[PDB]
Design a protein around this ligand. Sequence first.
Ligand SMILES: [K+]
Ligand SMILES: [K+]
Ligand SMILES: [K+]
Ligand SMILES: [K+]
Ligand SMILES: [K+]
Ligand SMILES: [K+]
Ligand SMILES: [K+]
Ligand SMILES: [K+]
Ligand SMILES: [K+]
Ligand SMILES: [K+]
Ligand SMILES: [K+]
Ligand SMILES: [K+]
Ligand SMILES: [K+]
Ligand SMILES: [K+]
Ligand SMILES: [K+]
Ligand SMILES: [K+]
Ligand SMILES: [K+]
Ligand SMILES: [K+]
Ligand SMILES: [K+]
Ligand SMILES: [K+]
Ligand SMILES: [K+]
Ligand SMILES: [K+]
Ligand SMILES: [K+]
Ligand SMILES: [K+]
Ligand SMILES: [K+]
Ligand SMILES: [K+]
Ligand SMILES: [K+]
Ligand SMILES: [Mg+2]
Ligand SMILES: [Mg+2]
Ligand SMILES: [Mg+2]
Ligand SMILES: [Mg+2]
Ligand SMILES: [Mg+2]
Ligand SMILES: [Mg+2]
Ligand SMILES: [Mg+2]
Ligand SMILES: [Mg+2]
Ligand SMILES: [Mg+2]
Ligand SMILES: [Mg+2]
Ligand SMILES: [Mg+2]
Ligand SMILES: [Mg+2]
Ligand SMILES: [Mg+2]
Ligand SMILES: [Mg+2]
Ligand SMILES: [Mg+2]
Ligand SMILES: [Mg+2]
Ligand SMILES: [Mg+2]
Ligand SMILES: [Mg+2]
Ligand SMILES: [Mg+2]
Ligand SMILES: [Mg+2]
Ligand SMILES: [Mg+2]
Ligand SMILES: [Mg+2]
Ligand SMILES: [Mg+2]
Ligand SMILES: [Mg+2]
Ligand SMILES: [Mg+2]
Ligand SMILES: [Mg+2]
Ligand SMILES: [Mg+2]
Ligand SMILES: [Mg+2]
Ligand SMILES: [Mg+2]
Ligand SMILES: [Mg+2]
Ligand SMILES: [Mg+2]
Ligand SMILES: [Mg+2]
Ligand SMILES: [Mg+2]
Ligand SMILES: [Mg+2]
Ligand SMILES: [Mg+2]
Ligand SMILES: [Mg+2]
Ligand SMILES: [Mg+2]
Ligand SMILES: [Mg+2]
Ligand SMILES: [Mg+2]
Ligand SMILES: [Mg+2]
Ligand SMILES: [Mg+2]
Ligand SMILES: [Mg+2]
Ligand SMILES: [Mg+2]
Ligand SMILES: [Mg+2]
Ligand SMILES: [Mg+2]
Ligand SMILES: [Mg+2]
Ligand SMILES: [Mg+2]
Ligand SMILES: [Mg+2]
Ligand SMILES: [Mg+2]
Ligand SMILES: [Mg+2]
Ligand SMILES: [Mg+2]
Ligand SMILES: [Mg+2]
Ligand SMILES: [Mg+2]
Ligand SMILES: [Mg+2]
Ligand SMILES: [Mg+2]
Ligand SMILES: [Mg+2]
Ligand SMILES: [Mg+2]
Ligand SMILES: [Mg+2]
Ligand SMILES: [Mg+2]
Ligand SMILES: [Mg+2]
Ligand SMILES: [Mg+2]
Ligand SMILES: [Mg+2]
Ligand SMILES: [Mg+2]
Ligand SMILES: [Mg+2]
Ligand SMILES: [Mg+2]
Ligand SMILES: [Mg+2]
Ligand SMILES: [Mg+2]
Ligand SMILES: [Zn+2]
Lengths: 104, 83, 124, 138, 208, 99
Amino acid sequence: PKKVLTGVVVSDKMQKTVTVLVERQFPHPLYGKVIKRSKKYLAHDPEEKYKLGDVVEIIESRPISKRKRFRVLRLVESGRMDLVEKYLIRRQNYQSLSKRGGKA
Amino acid sequence: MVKIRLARFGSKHNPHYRIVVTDARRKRDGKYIEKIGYYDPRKTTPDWLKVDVERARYWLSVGAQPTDTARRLLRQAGVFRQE
Amino acid sequence: PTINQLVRKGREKVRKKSKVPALKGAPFRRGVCTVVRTVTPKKPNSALRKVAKVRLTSGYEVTAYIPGEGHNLQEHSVVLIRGGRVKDLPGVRYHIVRGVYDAAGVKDRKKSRSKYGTKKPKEA
Amino acid sequence: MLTDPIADMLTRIRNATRVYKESTDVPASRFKEEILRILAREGFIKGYERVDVDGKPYLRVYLKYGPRRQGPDPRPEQVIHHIRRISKPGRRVYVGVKEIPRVRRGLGIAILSTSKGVLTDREARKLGVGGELICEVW
Amino acid sequence: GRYIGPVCRLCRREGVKLYLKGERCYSPKCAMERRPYPPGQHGQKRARRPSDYAVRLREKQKLRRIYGISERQFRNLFEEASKKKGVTGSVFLGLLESRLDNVVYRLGFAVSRRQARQLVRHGHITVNGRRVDLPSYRVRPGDEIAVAEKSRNLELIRQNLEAMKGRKVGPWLSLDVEGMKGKFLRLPDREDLALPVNEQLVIEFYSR
Amino acid sequence: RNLSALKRHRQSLKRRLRNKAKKSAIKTLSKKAVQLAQEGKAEEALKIMRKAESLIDKAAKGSTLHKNAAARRKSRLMRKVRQLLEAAGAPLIGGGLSA
RNA sequence: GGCUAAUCCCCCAUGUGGACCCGCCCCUUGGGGUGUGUCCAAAGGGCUUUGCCCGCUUCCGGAUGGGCCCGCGUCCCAUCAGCUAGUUGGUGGGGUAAUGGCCCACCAAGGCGACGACGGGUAGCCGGUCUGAGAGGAUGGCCGGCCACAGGGGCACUGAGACACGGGCCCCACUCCUACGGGAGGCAGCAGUUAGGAAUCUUCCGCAAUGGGCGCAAGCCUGACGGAGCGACGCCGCUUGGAGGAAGAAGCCCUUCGGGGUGUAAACUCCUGAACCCGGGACGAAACCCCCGACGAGGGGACUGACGGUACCGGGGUAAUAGCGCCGGCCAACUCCGUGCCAGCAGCCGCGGUAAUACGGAGGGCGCGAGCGUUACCCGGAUUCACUGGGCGUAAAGGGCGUGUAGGCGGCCUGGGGCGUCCCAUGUGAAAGACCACGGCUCAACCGUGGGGGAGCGUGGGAUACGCUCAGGCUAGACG
Ligand SMILES: [K+]
Ligand SMILES: [K+]
Ligand SMILES: [K+]
Ligand SMILES: [K+]
Ligand SMILES: [K+]
Ligand SMILES: [K+]
Ligand SMILES: [K+]
Ligand SMILES: [K+]
Ligand SMILES: [K+]
Ligand SMILES: [K+]
Ligand SMILES: [K+]
Ligand SMILES: [K+]
Ligand SMILES: [K+]
Ligand SMILES: [K+]
Ligand SMILES: [K+]
Ligand SMILES: [K+]
Ligand SMILES: [K+]
Ligand SMILES: [K+]
Ligand SMILES: [K+]
Ligand SMILES: [K+]
Ligand SMILES: [K+]
Ligand SMILES: [K+]
Ligand SMILES: [K+]
Ligand SMILES: [K+]
Ligand SMILES: [K+]
Ligand SMILES: [K+]
Ligand SMILES: [K+]
Ligand SMILES: [Mg+2]
Ligand SMILES: [Mg+2]
Ligand SMILES: [Mg+2]
Ligand SMILES: [Mg+2]
Ligand SMILES: [Mg+2]
Ligand SMILES: [Mg+2]
Ligand SMILES: [Mg+2]
Ligand SMILES: [Mg+2]
Ligand SMILES: [Mg+2]
Ligand SMILES: [Mg+2]
Ligand SMILES: [Mg+2]
Ligand SMILES: [Mg+2]
Ligand SMILES: [Mg+2]
Ligand SMILES: [Mg+2]
Ligand SMILES: [Mg+2]
Ligand SMILES: [Mg+2]
Ligand SMILES: [Mg+2]
Ligand SMILES: [Mg+2]
Ligand SMILES: [Mg+2]
Ligand SMILES: [Mg+2]
Ligand SMILES: [Mg+2]
Ligand SMILES: [Mg+2]
Ligand SMILES: [Mg+2]
Ligand SMILES: [Mg+2]
Ligand SMILES: [Mg+2]
Ligand SMILES: [Mg+2]
Ligand SMILES: [Mg+2]
Ligand SMILES: [Mg+2]
Ligand SMILES: [Mg+2]
Ligand SMILES: [Mg+2]
Ligand SMILES: [Mg+2]
Ligand SMILES: [Mg+2]
Ligand SMILES: [Mg+2]
Ligand SMILES: [Mg+2]
Ligand SMILES: [Mg+2]
Ligand SMILES: [Mg+2]
Ligand SMILES: [Mg+2]
Ligand SMILES: [Mg+2]
Ligand SMILES: [Mg+2]
Ligand SMILES: [Mg+2]
Ligand SMILES: [Mg+2]
Ligand SMILES: [Mg+2]
Ligand SMILES: [Mg+2]
Ligand SMILES: [Mg+2]
Ligand SMILES: [Mg+2]
Ligand SMILES: [Mg+2]
Ligand SMILES: [Mg+2]
Ligand SMILES: [Mg+2]
Ligand SMILES: [Mg+2]
Ligand SMILES: [Mg+2]
Ligand SMILES: [Mg+2]
Ligand SMILES: [Mg+2]
Ligand SMILES: [Mg+2]
Ligand SMILES: [Mg+2]
Ligand SMILES: [Mg+2]
Ligand SMILES: [Mg+2]
Ligand SMILES: [Mg+2]
Ligand SMILES: [Mg+2]
Ligand SMILES: [Mg+2]
Ligand SMILES: [Mg+2]
Ligand SMILES: [Mg+2]
Ligand SMILES: [Mg+2]
Ligand SMILES: [Mg+2]
Ligand SMILES: [Mg+2]
Ligand SMILES: [Mg+2]
Ligand SMILES: [Mg+2]
Ligand SMILES: [Mg+2]
Ligand SMILES: [Zn+2]
């Protein structure tokens, strides 16, 4: 069945497209500990209906573009930037770990 | 087209075929679609030929084309006997 | 380390390094003898051991021990080498196979003959 | 705070028994109490009871031991020879019924936590369920 | 290859009596009956406390040297025994005992195992009618091991089978001295066999 | 010193020229139609559109276009023509365009 | 340049139907229906010739095969940390069987990265295989599946299908032909040659069988395949003899010079009788086809064997290959002579400088046997990368200290949810292999039939203790 995923909209600076961050949890194959890895999906939002901070369902779809095979199925829960926050920061720390400038 | 034929399985001088449904283009001992019997040309045992005639009839009903030898074997097991 | 740590860095597998760059892993390599000297063993021992600098097809040049009572390896002998160092002569890590190519077998050998390329003593 | 209250308890007990204490108090939690019941029923402790140390709820855990002994060191054998935490914050361990262990060819027990409540490796095997392997005791 | 050579020296090294000759092994000429000490220039010297290894080695070498089987074949049987269900030691002895060349010896068609081997290779034996000349052929419970009809008139088979008139046969077998045939009733139980061997040590030798 | 199957190469070349030509026609008329429609010439543009439609379906009779390739072309054609017309309007000869 | 046939190409017609545009209905991404308009069909051949066969056209469906897309999984280096402009997305096109920046205009300014982007190294992936108690480690040869390539690079044509190993075009490198303008070619098919290498076979037989292409069929093609050949390369089976033979030949080796060992071993005696010589001699092969019947069901008859005069059965019949490593400890097996830190041995510890069980030989002995050793490489032992299953005061190992980001982890009670977790059913998990059983070659290797498993993933249903999440509460942590 068309895979359905739930996630948070972390970007919407694109036309009719939003970025959804989907987390997942599983037992490390050798160390057991439940670890939590995640991935971002560019989902189709033709009505520009979804905004930053929405937790949405996403459904496997027919290609809309390269790098874009999912459509926003529906809104699960509105606004909640606490999630958008983790992301933004986790990305900001990247500056402070190379050779140039950054923030601690 | 798809066929019903014999795939070789025994060993040197010890042939044992498998009556099989497969695409005509596949190598003979390659991936078949279904096994519907087996055949020992040297009748080394009382059970040298078995054919799932209900199944044979199915494939035959969908286009499967038997080899002249496969047909010969299927007949022997009353695949075409309409009596 | 903590499990979180093993999850973050994991264990590191041990890479085993060779003692026989007879290249291609190959069981044997062919070469030609450059020099055919003699060497002095280390500390505990003393004697005149027969070595041989060899230029391998492997595209290598290394010293290889010449086992047995007596040989016949000049400055252009075609030799076949195998793995096997000589604990006394640091730097010698291969043996010449007495019985192949130019390195003749040992004569009047009667025990461990196969290890010295000496055919079964004729006669009855 | 304690990072693992069940391990804290398993140890308070491990410790108390090594110096043959009478009882031992542990901060109370339903889950902890639930584990004691198995502990009691299988005859590892004499039982326990809710009490109020100071102003907060605890659980006197009446320990139990064998008889005095012969020769040097008369100290009695332990009822709880071994009591170890298996699942832990940082590394939770879950098992399927087909994967439930067998502590000392049966002479010991494993305490799982299932959706059918806290059970021993048999109560679990019986009800045909598995869950979080909490600890083993023998 | 099946060895082929001085057999009594094997008795001398194992210190026990193996019957690689049938008669003579019951006679005051048995060598074991007059030189129970190992062969070679040191047979009479003071034996040194054997090593745990030596003990196991010697013990297995004894059991194998009894059936005249190759270390190769021998090892394969043991592995097969180890795989099968049941006490490996016994199952091992059952299999070793199910070898036609051995069964032919048990039924007294031959004086020794090495003789029963030749009687098989040369067709003088039969299994359920059809002839078999494979010393290693495995007799199963219910089979009938007989002498080849064309062979029933052999000076050697005459003697051997005559001498059988009167002798008893293993509880797992059953001879018929008249018709020159017998039957493998069932796999011999450990108790039935009385070999000077501790199969336990053997299983350990292959455990190393 | 070789295979008489060089024949397939000869045949291919004729078949190639045969296809190339059928298509050139299709394109040329297709444009012609789109152009007339764009200029408001309805009766004229539809008239030509039908040839195009016909040539396309015909090309599909054999292995020139075959498939849904014709379908695709007819579609894109009738759409561009119907739309270009509607920007002045009045589909006279009511050629291929359905009511 | 000229002539000409067709199942070659084209035009008109017929419209079951189908395609396209627009509308309406159901359905929900471009699925199904309906209406008007437009557009689109075809090929003949053979006869036992007027009734069948082979074939043609359009459409719906089946079956097989395949394209594209998505989740998760898939080595080493962070002494590679920033990467990106068709780049990321949008609108409109083009292109295709089809989605898509696949391609193109135009607009936006995005996309990716420590959960390792980008870069560098290495590498076809898998079923499986080897090893291991397992977890795991290593591996991907044969066989089966998928992918990629066909001298190197690029490209399209034809076609249901190709960007085509024995098709085409261009560039490049090479070989050959050349009357110097210009042409020809590609064994990573079978066999073979040459080069490289430690090392890898026959320019064999057959199309009898299984399979494939074309043909109504007869039949043709098939280095696919079925066989044979070479190589102990591996596995399995088998032989070089069996029984009797001296308080024990000779020779050889030790010796307390009494004697001890090789050893029932030999010679001998009797028995069987591998090799070899005769006779017989196969399964694999019954279909296609023909006749009857209806070209069906059914019945009947005929042809056909490379392997091969091989397997195997019967008769006769000789007593007739044994080697290799090792014997100081680990490690099973000891003495003499020779040599004198020499000649040499050596896996580690070590051995030899005058009486060496360690060097060399001999006698004897242990091991294994058509093999035995050696080298190389993988797993093991090695809980020595420790998940199972390790450690850091002095053995290697605590960061010089703090502050703190991400992350990891989280006290007590109640409730909702049910992501983790657990349960049931179900689908999937090809065949081969592996396991068990029975069975076919005299056994076995090998092979056939059958059975039993299986983690993971999809779907439906269920549980809610623990973890997570949401909501509320508490004061024992923390803070004031
Ligand atoms: K950045
Ligand atoms: K069908
Ligand atoms: K054409
Ligand atoms: K012409
Ligand atoms: K119409
Ligand atoms: K169809
Ligand atoms: K299909
Ligand atoms: K499909
Ligand atoms: K587009
Ligand atoms: K384990
Ligand atoms: K692996
Ligand atoms: K791999
Ligand atoms: K693997
Ligand atoms: K045909
Ligand atoms: K018929
Ligand atoms: K014969
Ligand atoms: K002889
Ligand atoms: K001397
Ligand atoms: K000395
Ligand atoms: K010595
Ligand atoms: K020596
Ligand atoms: K290792
Ligand atoms: K330090
Ligand atoms: K520092
Ligand atoms: K709840
Ligand atoms: K395995
Ligand atoms: K499932
Ligand atoms: Mg937006
Ligand atoms: Mg995901
Ligand atoms: Mg020295
Ligand atoms: Mg070495
Ligand atoms: Mg030596
Ligand atoms: Mg067993
Ligand atoms: Mg072991
Ligand atoms: Mg042609
Ligand atoms: Mg033009
Ligand atoms: Mg002309
Ligand atoms: Mg119509
Ligand atoms: Mg419609
Ligand atoms: Mg309509
Ligand atoms: Mg009209
Ligand atoms: Mg028409
Ligand atoms: Mg006609
Ligand atoms: Mg588009
Ligand atoms: Mg399109
Ligand atoms: Mg692009
Ligand atoms: Mg940027
Ligand atoms: Mg490569
Ligand atoms: Mg291990
Ligand atoms: Mg295993
Ligand atoms: Mg494994
Ligand atoms: Mg393969
Ligand atoms: Mg090439
Ligand atoms: Mg075609
Ligand atoms: Mg085409
Ligand atoms: Mg081609
Ligand atoms: Mg290709
Ligand atoms: Mg070629
Ligand atoms: Mg060469
Ligand atoms: Mg053929
Ligand atoms: Mg054929
Ligand atoms: Mg003598
Ligand atoms: Mg004898
Ligand atoms: Mg005879
Ligand atoms: Mg005779
Ligand atoms: Mg034929
Ligand atoms: Mg006729
Ligand atoms: Mg007729
Ligand atoms: Mg018939
Ligand atoms: Mg020893
Ligand atoms: Mg001297
Ligand atoms: Mg000297
Ligand atoms: Mg000396
Ligand atoms: Mg000694
Ligand atoms: Mg030694
Ligand atoms: Mg390990
Ligand atoms: Mg650990
Ligand atoms: Mg350590
Ligand atoms: Mg230190
Ligand atoms: Mg410090
Ligand atoms: Mg801090
Ligand atoms: Mg924090
Ligand atoms: Mg908590
Ligand atoms: Mg948290
Ligand atoms: Mg759930
Ligand atoms: Mg399942
Ligand atoms: Mg399978
Ligand atoms: Mg059998
Ligand atoms: Mg099977
Ligand atoms: Mg399961
Ligand atoms: Mg479910
Ligand atoms: Mg609930
Ligand atoms: Mg809750
Ligand atoms: Mg709260
Ligand atoms: Zn004896």
